[PDB]
Design an enzyme around this catalytic site. Sequence first.
Site, PDB file in Angstrom:
ATOM      1  N   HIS A  37       0.893  -1.174   0.000  1.00 41.61           N
ATOM      2  CA  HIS A  37       0.000   0.000   0.000  1.00 41.61           C
ATOM      3  C   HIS A  37       0.901   1.183   0.000  1.00 41.61           C
ATOM      4  CE1 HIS A  37      -3.532  -2.253   1.260  1.00 41.61           C
ATOM      5  NE2 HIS A  37      -2.903  -2.734   2.341  1.00 41.61           N
ATOM      6  N   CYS A  84      -4.581   5.184  -1.843  1.00 45.95           N
ATOM      7  CA  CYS A  84      -3.511   4.227  -1.990  1.00 45.95           C
ATOM      8  C   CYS A  84      -3.278   4.136  -3.499  1.00 45.95           C
ATOM      9  CB  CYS A  84      -3.978   2.849  -1.541  1.00 45.95           C
ATOM     10  SG  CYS A  84      -2.734   1.611  -1.868  1.00 45.95           S
ATOM     11  N   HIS A  87      -4.257   0.756  -4.964  1.00 47.80           N
ATOM     12  CA  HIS A  87      -5.641   0.290  -4.735  1.00 47.80           C
ATOM     13  C   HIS A  87      -6.712   1.346  -4.889  1.00 47.80           C
ATOM     14  CE1 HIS A  87      -3.513  -2.955  -2.129  1.00 47.80           C
ATOM     15  NE2 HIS A  87      -3.562  -3.299  -3.460  1.00 47.80           N
ATOM     16  N   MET A  92      -9.881   2.153  -2.244  1.00 46.78           N
ATOM     17  CA  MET A  92      -9.007   2.441  -1.144  1.00 46.78           C
ATOM     18  C   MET A  92      -8.632   3.918  -1.152  1.00 46.78           C
ATOM     19  SD  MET A  92      -5.810   0.399   0.505  1.00 46.78           S
ATOM     20  CE  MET A  92      -5.108   1.055   2.028  1.00 46.78           C
TER      21      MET A  92
HETATM   22 CU   LIG Z   1      -3.476  -0.173  -0.814  1.00 50.07          CU
END
Ligand SMILES: [Cu+]
Length: 99
Positions: A37, A84, A87, A92
């Site tokens: 991440h 992120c 993501h 995210m």
């Molecule tokens: Cu992530």
Amino acid sequence: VDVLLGADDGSLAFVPSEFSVPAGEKIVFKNNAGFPHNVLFDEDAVPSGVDVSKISMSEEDLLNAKGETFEVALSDKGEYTFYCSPHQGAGMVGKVIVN
Ligand SMILES: [Cu+]
């Protein structure tokens, strides 16, 4: 305040994903589960005056191990969206309100 990167159940979420903090409190993004991440702020969704490059990891930099952290302290009041890089297309993303 601590913000987990990935939920214990493997969800690609910031935990918490929306929270408020007083200007200048250190926010500690803490790598938690389901890596990689990272943490970047969205240049289109921060208070006017804010330079996201100063409060974002570099896109190429990823947290791949539990307990690594990225720490920032935001001084300008208003709403900030952070995401992120890996993501962000999977939802995210999160919102911190600095008051
Ligand atoms: Cu992530």
